[PDB]
Design an enzyme around this catalytic site. Structure first.
Site, PDB file in Angstrom:
ATOM      1  N   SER A  24       0.837  -1.178   0.000  1.00  0.00           N
ATOM      2  CA  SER A  24       0.000   0.000   0.000  1.00  0.00           C
ATOM      3  C   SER A  24       0.872   1.227   0.000  1.00  0.00           C
ATOM      4  O   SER A  24       1.731   1.380   0.856  1.00  0.00           O
ATOM      5  CB  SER A  24      -0.901   0.015   1.226  1.00  0.00           C
ATOM      6  OG  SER A  24      -2.054   0.794   0.988  1.00  0.00           O
ATOM      7  N   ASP A 141      11.054   5.944 -16.291  1.00  0.00           N
ATOM      8  CA  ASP A 141      11.248   5.624 -14.906  1.00  0.00           C
ATOM      9  C   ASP A 141      11.717   4.205 -14.737  1.00  0.00           C
ATOM     10  O   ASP A 141      10.981   3.376 -14.242  1.00  0.00           O
ATOM     11  CB  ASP A 141       9.964   5.846 -14.136  1.00  0.00           C
ATOM     12  CG  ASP A 141      10.057   5.369 -12.733  1.00  0.00           C
ATOM     13  OD1 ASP A 141      11.074   4.755 -12.404  1.00  0.00           O
ATOM     14  OD2 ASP A 141       9.125   5.603 -11.958  1.00  0.00           O
TER      15      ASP A 141
END
Ligand SMILES: CN1CCN(c2ccc(Nc3ncc4nc(Nc5ccccc5)n(C5CCCCC5)c4n3)cc2)CC1
Ligand SMILES: [Cl-]
Length: 310
Positions: A24, A141
């Protein structure tokens, strides 16, 4: 340009159940899950990434864009999007990678990690990067954190949220090339520099880059001509390849296809190029694996083996 005829697949929430939370962060959470196609009678292990019940529109544009890219790519060494569920908020379903991200993996298993493995991943990552170049996509990225392990042997690239088409108008400073840092200029070659860092992360078994150094600091440091240190296990050749990635002139930087070739050669004689103590001794795990808590995984099929027309 060419039309994108990739098919976007929509899945009912009823189709899959989310067993556990892999991670999370921020407004987004990712769950390990099982997906069953409607009449298929196959069970597929999947990762479901859902941005928050908070449904801010700006976020939604962001998640959807990432899915669009994921839907659009097919390669062994790139992660792909299985389909999307539109209930409540958009979620992305993609094949689960059991062993997690490579960066975590190196840190955890560093004692047992072989030279042959390190080179192979290096080759594999390059192959994935090359494919994107073929598709004219700049990942923008690339990091060891963004590489996922299906198995120790097999890894693929992911996190296409920042991805853009080449030459399109449309923050990891340490990974980013100088041209990108100074001028927000991104090109595959900019991408290549990032690969060099990723290689450095693997080589050092997950060591942080420019550790203890502020990001604002980095641009000047690079400006000076400073660069990451040779890793202890790195032979001069392997390191030398890394340095090329960090060249001021991007055209100077090696092409991804070239990188695949050079590493591939090294993989033939891994011992020559990387020195590790007890290299011969180390061995790594394989997949049944049943990571998910299920009695009945007779029908489990990997996403890689699960195919649909077109
Ligand atoms: C030591 N722990 C570390 C955490 N861990 C673990 C983490 C990930 C996996 N596998 C796996 N597979 C697919 C994924 N697809 C996304 N993400 C993703 C990105 C775009 C679309 C759909 C999924 N992820 C995220 C990557 C960020 C961290 C949480 C898992 C994924 N993660 C297996 C184990 C258990 C072991
Ligand atoms: Cl950073």
């Amino acid at each position: 340009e060419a039309p994108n005829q990739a098919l976007l697949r929509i899945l009912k929430e009823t189709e899959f159940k989310k067993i556990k939370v892999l991670g999370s962060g921020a407004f987004g959470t990712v769950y390990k899950g099982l997906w069953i196609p409607e009449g298929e009678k196959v069970k597929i292990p999947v990762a479901i990434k859902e941005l928050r019940e908070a449904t801010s529109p700006k976020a939604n544009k962001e998640i959807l864009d990432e899915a669009y890219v994921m839907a659009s790519v097919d390669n062994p060494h790139v992660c792909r999007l299985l389909g999307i569920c539109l209930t409540s908020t958009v979620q992305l379903i993609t094949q689960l990678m059991p062993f997690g991200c490579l960066l975590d993996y190196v840190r955890e298993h560093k004692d047992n990690i072989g030279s042959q493995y390190l080179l192979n991943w290096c080759v594999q990552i390059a192959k994935g990067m090359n494919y994107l170049e073929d598709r004219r996509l700049v990942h923008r990225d690339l990091a060891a954190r963004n590489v996922l392990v299906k198995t120790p042997q097999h890894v693929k690239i992911t996190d296409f949220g920042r991805a853009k088409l080449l030459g399109a108008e449309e923050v990891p400073i340490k990974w980013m090339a100088l041209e990108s840092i100074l001028h927000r200029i991104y090109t595959h070659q900019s991408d290549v520099w990032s690969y060099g860092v990723t290689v450095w992360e693997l080589m050092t078994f997950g060591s942080k880059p420019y550790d203890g150094i502020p990001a604002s600091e980095i641009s000047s440091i690079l400006e000076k001509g400073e660069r990451l240190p040779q890793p202890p296990i790195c032979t001069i050749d392997v390191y030398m390849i890394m340095v090329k990635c960090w060249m001021i002139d991007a055209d100077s930087r090696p092409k991804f296809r070239e990188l695949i070739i050079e590493f591939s050669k090294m993989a033939r004689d891994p011992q020559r190029y990387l020195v590790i103590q007890g290299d011969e001794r180390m061995h790594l795990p394989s997949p049944y694996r049943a990571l998910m808590d299920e009695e009945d995984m007779d029908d489990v099929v990997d996403a890689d083996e699960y195919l649909i027309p077109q």
